[PDB]
């Protein structure tokens, strides 16, 4: 049992007709001070997977080297480490799941919410979350904690069941992800501006965007508002 | 303080027919008043014509789902692919609840099958491991609003013969799969209006002596 | 502890064409001991009917308690009330007890005598109004009564088709709950008659 | 205090109340009369807290006492328990509630019928044939559920009621002593001096 | 609240309020109290002006104070009743705290210090 | 819950109500609560569902491997020390039991053990256990003796349940008899309370206070 | 909540952020923090928003019952009747407000009154969760008798660095400007004071 | 529960869910939750049921009586300050979460209230547990200059937002538009998604079905002459 | 269990014990004996907490019946209450104690003398002419305290126990039963069946 | 606490206060906070005393035996074996650790490792109580490839501000300089950085 210290914030992520799409802001928290404004908590695994993390950073780092380590053991004598016997999402997703779910029954959890992003060898989506409890589920649309208040009723508008999946082109998708970005800014008051967002899809592959930033606020209707109530100037 | 158990909300359903059973159950997940999938799957197919439920707290469903299927397995490698009956699944699922009385897995388990006379049969276990057979046994968060109406329209408790006043009660007269399905999906049409937790979709698994069949109906979404 | 459950009880009201219903059982307990068999959780003012579930000393109390108003609602207005009107008698009664409540849950039922029109009503037990159309439920048993009616109910049953239906509805939700049962009354309200049956049910 | 019974047979009412008083530690009596007559037809036994169930019975007795010199007529035990109820239910929502049970029995002159009421410390009131408070119930119920007929004399009331002392005495832990009967009907209230 | 000296000394040395209360005891009806050796008798006068009275439910003029004591009055009719009903409730306060019936002189006592206090009380007759 | 178990001249009577109950909410009304050891071996179920059911069957697994290894049917005192000592390793960690272990061996005779989950292993004549045992024991204690016969012991059985799931609101559902013999025990049916407490009324004349 | 006032040459100038939390949802995101009790006399709230809302209203009741009787009251007596409910009902209030004004008489002045319900009168104040990031930065740049240009810069550079820091705080930057010549409200988004 | 607020042009709205729940349970299918204070200042409300009836119709009816005394027609102002300072004097035990919206001759207004008694000014705002899905959409699609039609729009699709992810909501949607220079108009039930499917089965019971042990008339009339 | 007394007089040593077993509400059993025999000269009484007493009392029993095959000799009642003194203050200071109370009589075959001794859960050893555990000393010792001589005949320690119980029975709030007696002596230990 | 390493053009510096407390009782006003674990690795510690000083020696032992074995061991290898302590023992510490080192092929590098016992390699890192009121100020006033006399003026002018506010921290300000040429200790005096 613990408590977290530097904390990253939300996770989010949905399905498209050829692949999936993971974001996350750069932001470690320390409490209400934003401590660290640099910080990736997107981590890709070869060029098929990105796992998305959230919570304490410190046990982030360490699913990292996980992750880093998981990578070297698979090329162990394995002449097809590059090919047929890659890493996939499943097999990444399943791992940690199992560590998520072990950790927590010692009762000395990894304090995180954690989404796996990715594409399998056949072609199809992979899109499943994780906890520091263990618990695991699937769906059209994922995101970590403000995230799932804010992001998912957004994003569920694209995609709201598996037949929607097909009509959702990597255009329309991107967009409701960078949207659903500058929504959680305006209203998460443990967000940062900056964010990274990966692309995988099953044609064009990996596509890892960093530094980018929410843009095309609006501010300006500020300027009328005055007092909180019979105020006029 | 880390609290090492969840509730993931969700209701289940076992019915057990003259010559099958089914299993049913909702599709939805959820955390407090957030949803976190409208379609994850809650029943499972466990091999040797057996079907599983495990409701509650998902990650220690999973978890005891995966090692009774894996007891399934290393029950055929020792003895030699002998199959496995229901009442045998139900004796070794205690053990496996029993095992952790002391850190239990937080899950309500409900199987279902055919027993070896070919006839149906639905188990019922508590989170440390006592079990029963029973003929009819709802699970989870809205099992108060539906066990009530299933005494009433399957077992006809309260239900007199007209014109006796009482005296002659309604006689038991066995049900078809069609007619168990109609109860099983009015039971959740019911239950989702009045439960927050239930809805999105309903998923049934049959079992007869052909096999494990599937079917899938909508439940409202709000 | 919890005062809405130490002894137990369940109402539940429906309508139907061109009349009402409303019924209870008859338990009173002490936690797990029962106590009485005879303890009637519905009362009348006028053509208005009340049932009240929870705590046994407040149902007592409320009944007493809107029996006095009622009686002087009658000599001041020359005229019985109505359920429309004693429904936000009971509302505003409950809330003037905000930070020290009546543990009940109040069901009003009764037929408009002007207009005809079948009227239910249910609360909280700080007074919230929840009006329905179709059926209101309350006590130990809530939940059970609920999965009853939900399914069982349809619109526009004839008085003897309705009696029917809220007597399997309370019996089989009081089977279910161990503070419940122990008899049961149910009251077939229409414009100018009133029928009450008392049902037999098991005794455990 | 600990056990007080109540039986209601074809022609009056019979309280038993135990005779036990414990401080704690020692029983420091063994021939307290847990009762007080509130009219010449209506008597009220008693069982709560300490010092409470005294303060109540003498004060619900003055009450009682007042309005029959007021009117120069005896209450009905239907009115006498209403009353009674009306201010228990009062009490509990007080700044110190009395912590007190009580049984009436009582004799209706008008209806010629014995009446038994159980009343509890939340003011909630019952009717019954027979009755009890605290765990006394949970031993005596039992048998009267299976012996009790509404057409028994005072005789069998009295055997009836030997038989649920014998089990109390029995299989409850506390040695309360014994009991004190009383007996209400038509001609009044009597104390039944041998048991 | 209203506090008006309504009794009051008079240059002669005389409360006139008083003396006119004790007027309105001279027109009321004649009451007569005798006892004997083992028992007291209390008479009372009914003025024969009121026929078509229903004497069954008409106030009696003697009262019932507790069960051994008794009170009758000459006067105002109205105001015997206050101290009628103060009397029954101080009875049954002295049984409940002393556990002893009152004395007839106690009773007496009592009564006639309720009849004082109104002498010298303001805003009250 | 409601369980019983009494000696008398014709062997031992065991019997229990069938109601299981999560709070208010009644979860079964066909539990059972009378847990088959072996042939010749029956035990009770009160407290913890699964600690009794799982001990029980265990017991029954020990009971088994005795009269394998000393070939000869174990006797009831020592059956029932081996469950008693079981628990006794586990007391402090939460277990709940109270259970009758109940024989009838040439040795001993019949014999009934209550046991314990804080160590308690009594022998006697008649034992109560349960939310209603108190309703049972008036009933049991004002009506036996040792020269009943076996059918009128198996409804005083029958009836003392009957006592206890009318009052107790968390006993019912229906009545399970058991008669243990020296020859093994011979099971004597469920019995519905809502039909058994009517019939009970009616040919007894009991329940007065019940309008039927 | 970053809030802070500033005395200068020709007056008083009050600034604020617009975030407004409970938690970590920020359940207003254009807040007016900055709040008018007489003419030239404003002031700058933080900690409970219905405290802070409920003592402001009394504040200008009070104020403006004296102006009908007195006349123009001063920023000291202002500040007085702040300090009187909140040192009063201390243990029922959580509120950390700051009082400016602009007298002819007395020119700009500024009177902190922090959660015991103090009062301590000085040339600038700062105050709320994000004030703590700087303090450093505002004793090292602040200087007396600064112009308005001055004087807007600082403010706006302070709460920049309060906002950036301070998780609790954010939105736009909000002033009011206390001179001779009048009320002057000033706002300033996030593009504009993020890339200082 | 999901409500919101929205202005627009040449005046506001404000729709809310049907929702109400006890702890999982829904108590009412079809809850109205579009309070009026005044004919034309209304509000919406949230958390304790009862006290935000309560609330409302207290300072409601103070209204009408303010009102009367003045010869004018209410203003929002004085709904907000009349509900604050009660709200604030009970230090947040009377639980009711408002959002108060209304024209009057000042113009119209759009306002939020908290238990607590603290207030906010908007063009958009959103309170209960589907806030936050509610609030998403509001910060999506939410411009300056919406007319009546983009408002309603907003609103609706808003509390469906609130509906759909929200457990604590669901069922309809009630609407409520008040324009400047016109009756308030009230839109109980503006949109039913949330139609139950027909049974596969009926229920309704043979006669003679329940078992009945006495049956008596009940005498509801008065005492009878002669 | 409850209570539990001992006196040593003259030439041997008297054990009395209650038979009453209460789980919470009821008393499961009325004729339960507390003791266990160690040696044929050596008798052991018990109360404390539920299965522990048993438990603790037959490992005792085991032991010294071990000891006896082993050397052919009866251990002394002093070298026992040694032994058991040993296992309790092992006990004490362990992850989950023995929570039991005894009394150890003993006539010693090598002495010719009677010896009473009482230790608690704790393992506080004392040697003394009359004992007990619990509450069952407040009442019982100012009787002993003056009618005690080290002179007394085995009938004279019994009319005295059976004044110590009397007034057990009069001012204890518990009804433990009655109590069965037990005497230990040169020609070992016997039960009175009539007490 | 207030502390902070600073890296620049030739290198890094180290900077810190003396003061160590135990409760309000200033316990030692002349400490050392600037700890080496290798000649050119050095240390800031904060929190904890005794877990800050126990977890230094066992990363001086692991370095020294790194050095007999593998030869000069980097800064980024002395952060991780901080780190693994940290990290690993997280339940038991209470230790804040900026590290700071010079090699010839990286150059200047600085590791911050907060409570939860993560890395965090920054361009400099400030740390400890007293560091919460120089956020604004240190921002603001950093800049990168600084040089010795730039560095050593921004740490003694962020420290001063740091000692003046928090009430933890105070007494002498201590340095140490880490290049190329070797280790040089600097040493400043109240009377010196007070008047700043
Ligand atoms: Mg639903
Ligand atoms: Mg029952
Ligand atoms: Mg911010």
């Known amino acids: 049992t613990q408590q977290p210290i530097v904390t990253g914030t939300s996770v989010i992520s949905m399905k498209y007709d050829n692949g999936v799409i993971i974001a996350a802001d750069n932001l470690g928290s320390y409490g209400s001070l934003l401590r660290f404004n640099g910080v990736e908590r997107l981590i890709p695994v070869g060029d098929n997977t990105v796992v998305g993390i959230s919570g304490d950073i410190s046990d982030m780092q360490h699913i990292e080297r996980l992750l880093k380590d998981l990578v070297t053991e698979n090329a162990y004598d394995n002449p097809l480490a590059d090919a047929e016997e890659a890493l996939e999402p499943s097999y990444i997703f399943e791992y940690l799941a199992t560590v998520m779910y072990q950790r927590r029954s010692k009762m000395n959890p990894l304090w995180n919410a954690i989404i796996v992003a990715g594409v399998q060898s056949n072609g199809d989506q992979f899109l499943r979350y994780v906890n520091l409890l263990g618990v695991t589920y699937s769906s059209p649309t994922l995101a970590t904690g403000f995230g799932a208040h804010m992001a998912n009723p957004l994003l569920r508008k694209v995609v709201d069941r598996e037949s929607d999946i097909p009509k959702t082109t990597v255009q329309v998708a991107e967009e409701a992800i960078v949207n659903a970005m500058r929504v959680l800014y305006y209203r998460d008051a443990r967000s940062s501006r900056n964010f990274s967002l990966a692309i995988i899809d099953k044609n064009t592959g990996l596509t890892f965007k960093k530094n980018l930033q929410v843009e095309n606020m609006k501010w300006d209707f500020a300027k009328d508002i005055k007092g909180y109530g019979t105020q006029k100037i | 303080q880390f609290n090492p158990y969840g509730d993931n909300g969700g209701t289940i359903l076992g019915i057990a027919g003259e010559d099958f059973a089914v299993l049913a159950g909702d599709t939805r997940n959820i955390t407090d008043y957030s949803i976190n999938s409208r379609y994850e799957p809650k029943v499972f197919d466990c091999g040797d014509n057996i079907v599983m439920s495990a409701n509650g707290f998902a990650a220690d469903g999973d978890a005891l789902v995966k090692r009774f299927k894996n007891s399934v397995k290393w029950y055929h490698f020792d003895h030699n692919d002998k199959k496995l009956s229901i009442n045998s699944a139900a004796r070794n699922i205690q053990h496996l609840l029993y095992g952790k009385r002391f850190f239990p897995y937080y899950v309500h388990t409900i199987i279902a099958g055919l027993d070896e006379d070919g006839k149906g049969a639905v188990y019922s276990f508590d989170p440390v491991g006592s079990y029963e057979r029973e003929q009819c046994r709802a699970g989870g968060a809205a099992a108060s609003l539906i066990m009530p109406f299933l005494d009433n329209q399957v077992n006809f408790k309260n239900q007199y013969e007209p014109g006796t006043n009482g005296k002659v009660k309604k006689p038991l007269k066995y049900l078809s799969v069609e007619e168990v399905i109609k109860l099983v999906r009015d039971s959740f049409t019911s239950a989702t209006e009045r439960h927050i937790q239930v809805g999105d979709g309903l998923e049934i698994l049959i079992v007869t002596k052909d096999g494990v069949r599937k079917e899938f109906y909508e439940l409202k979404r709000d | 502890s919890d005062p809405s459950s130490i002894n137990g009880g369940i109402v539940v009201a429906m309508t139907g064409k061109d009349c009402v219903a409303i019924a209870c059982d008859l338990r009173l307990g002490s936690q797990s001991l029962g106590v009485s068999n005879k303890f009637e959780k519905i009362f009348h003012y006028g053509h208005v009917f009340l049932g009240i579930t929870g705590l046994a000393t407040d149902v007592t109390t409320l009944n007493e308690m809107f029996r006095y108003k009622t009686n002087l609602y009658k000599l001041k207005e020359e005229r019985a009330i109505e359920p429309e009107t004693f429904t936000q008698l009971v509302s505003s009664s409950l809330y003037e007890r905000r930070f020290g409540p009546y543990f009940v849950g109040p069901v009003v039922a009764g037929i408009n005598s002007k207009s005809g029109k079948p009227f239910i009503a249910g609360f909280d037990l700080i007074g919230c109004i929840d009006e329905a159309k179709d059926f209101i439920v309350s006590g130990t048993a809530s939940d059970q009564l609920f999965g009853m009616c939900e399914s069982l109910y349809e619109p526009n049953l004839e008085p003897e088709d309705l009696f029917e239906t809220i007597s399997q509805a309370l019996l089989n939700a009081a089977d279910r709950d161990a503070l419940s049962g122990w008899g049961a009354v149910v009251y077939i309200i229409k414009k100018d008659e009133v029928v009450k049956r008392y049902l037999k049910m098991r005794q455990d | 205090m600990d056990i007080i019974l109540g039986i209601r047979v074809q022609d009056s009412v019979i309280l038993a109340s135990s005779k036990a008083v414990t401080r704690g530690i020692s029983v420091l009596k063994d021939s307290d009369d847990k009762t007080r007559q509130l009219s010449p037809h209506t008597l009220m036994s008693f069982a709560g807290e300490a010092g409470d169930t005294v303060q109540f019975a003498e004060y619900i007795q003055a009450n009682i006492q007042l309005y029959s010199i007021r009117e120069d007529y005896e209450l009905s035990p239907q009115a006498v328990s209403s009353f009674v109820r009306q201010e228990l239910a009062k009490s509990i929502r007080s700044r110190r509630p009395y912590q007190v049970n009580v049984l009436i029995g009582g004799y209706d002159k008008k209806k010629n019928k014995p009446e038994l009421y159980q009343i509890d410390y939340l003011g909630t009131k019952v009717e019954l044939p027979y009755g009890a408070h605290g765990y006394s119930g949970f031993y005596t119920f039992s048998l009267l559920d299976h012996h009790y007929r509404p057409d028994m004399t005072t005789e069998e009331g009295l055997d009836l009621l030997k038989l649920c002392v014998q089990e109390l005495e029995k299989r409850m832990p506390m040695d309360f002593k014994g009991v004190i009967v009383k007996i209400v009907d038509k001609d009044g209230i009597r104390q039944v001096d041998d048991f | ?125 | 819950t409601t369980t019983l178990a009494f000696r008398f001249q014709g062997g031992i009577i065991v019997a229990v109500d069938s109601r299981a109950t999560a709070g208010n909410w009644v979860a079964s009304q066909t539990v059972k609560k009378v847990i088959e050891i072996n042939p010749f071996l029956l035990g009770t179920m009160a407290g913890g569902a699964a600690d009794c059911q799982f001990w029980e069957t265990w017991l029954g697994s020990q009971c088994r491997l005795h009269e394998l290894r000393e070939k000869e049917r174990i006797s009831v005192a020592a059956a029932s020390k081996i469950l008693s000592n079981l628990v006794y390793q586990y007391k402090g960690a939460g277990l709940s039991m109270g259970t009758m272990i109940c024989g009838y061996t040439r040795k001993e005779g019949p014999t009934i053990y209550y046991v314990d989950s804080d160590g308690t292993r009594l022998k006697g004549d008649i034992f109560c256990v349960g939310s209603g045992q108190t309703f049972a024991y008036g009933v049991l204690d004002s009506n036996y003796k040792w020269d009943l016969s076996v059918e009128d012991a198996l409804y005083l059985g029958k009836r003392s349940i009957l006592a206890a799931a009318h009052r107790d609101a968390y006993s019912g559902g229906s009545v399970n008899l058991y008669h243990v013999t020296e020859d093994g025990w011979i099971y004597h049916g469920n019995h519905d309370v809502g039909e058994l407490f009517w019939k009970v009324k009616e040919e007894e004349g009991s329940f007065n206070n019940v309008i039927g | 909540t970053s809030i802070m006032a500033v005395t200068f040459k020709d007056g008083v100038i009050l600034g604020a952020d617009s975030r407004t939390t409970t938690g970590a949802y920020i359940a207003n995101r254009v807040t007016d923090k900055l709040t008018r009790v007489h003419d030239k006399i404003w002031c700058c709230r933080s900690g409970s928003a219905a405290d802070t809302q409920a003592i402001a209203d009394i504040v200008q009741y009070h104020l403006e019952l004296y102006t009908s009787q007195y006349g123009t009251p001063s920023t000291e007596t202002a500040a007085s009747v702040f300090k009187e409910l909140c040192y009063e009902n201390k243990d029922n209030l959580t509120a950390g407000i700051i009082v400016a004004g602009y007298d002819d008489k007395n020119k700009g002045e500024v009177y902190t009154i922090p959660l015991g319900g103090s009062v301590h009168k000085l040339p600038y104040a700062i105050a709320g969760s994000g004030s703590t990031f700087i303090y450093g930065y505002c004793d090292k740049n602040f200087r007396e008798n600064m112009s308005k240009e001055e004087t807007v810069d600082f403010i706006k550079h302070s709460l920049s660095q309060a906002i950036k820091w301070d998780g609790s705080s954010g939105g736009v930057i909000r002033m009011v400007v206390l001179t001779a010549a009048g009320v002057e409200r000033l706002i300033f988004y996030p593009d504009e004071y993020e890339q200082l | 529960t999901t409500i919101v607020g929205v202005k627009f042009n040449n005046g506001v709205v404000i729709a809310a869910d049907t929702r109400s729940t006890q702890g999982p349970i829904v108590a009412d299918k079809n809850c109205a939750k579009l309070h009026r204070i005044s004919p034309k200042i209304w509000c919406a409300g949230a958390g304790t049921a009862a006290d935000t009836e309560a609330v409302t119709q207290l300072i409601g009816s103070n209204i009408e009586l303010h009102s009367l005394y003045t010869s004018r027609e209410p203003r929002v102002v004085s709904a907000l300050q009349m509900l604050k300072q009660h709200l604030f004097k009970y230090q947040g035990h009377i639980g009711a979460y408002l959002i108060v919206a209304g024209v009057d001759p000042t113009g119209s207004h759009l306002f939020s209230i908290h238990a607590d008694g603290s207030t906010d000014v908007g063009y958009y705002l959103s309170l209960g547990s589907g806030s936050l899905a509610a609030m998403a959409v509001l910060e999506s699609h939410w411009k300056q200059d919406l007319t009546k039609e983009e408002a309603i729009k907003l609103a609706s699709d808003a509390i469906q937002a609130g509906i759909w992810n929200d457990l604590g909501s669901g069922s309809n949607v009630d609407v409520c538009v008040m324009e400047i220079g016109k009756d308030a108009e009230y839109l109980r039930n503006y949109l039913t998604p949330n139609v139950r499917e027909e049974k596969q089965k009926s229920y309704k019971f043979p006669r003679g079905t329940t078992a009945v042990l006495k049956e008596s008339i009940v005498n509801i009339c008065d005492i009878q002459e002669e």
């Open chain 5, 1 to 125: 609240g209203y506090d008006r000296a309504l009794s009051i000394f008079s240059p002669d040395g005389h409360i006139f309020q008083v003396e006119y209360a004790l007027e309105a005891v001279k027109r009321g009806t004649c009451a007569v109290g005798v006892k004997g050796k083992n028992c007291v008798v209390l008479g009372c006068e009914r003025r024969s002006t009121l026929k078509l009275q229903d004497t069954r439910i008409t106030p009696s003029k003697v009262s019932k104070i507790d069960s051994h004591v008794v009170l009758s009055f000459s006067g105002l009719n109205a105001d015997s009743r206050i101290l009628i009903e103060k009397a029954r409730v101080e009875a049954q306060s002295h049984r409940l705290t002393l556990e002893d019936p009152v004395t007839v002189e106690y009773l007496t006592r009592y009564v006639a210090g309720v009849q004082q206090r109104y002498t010298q009380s303001g805003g009250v007759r």
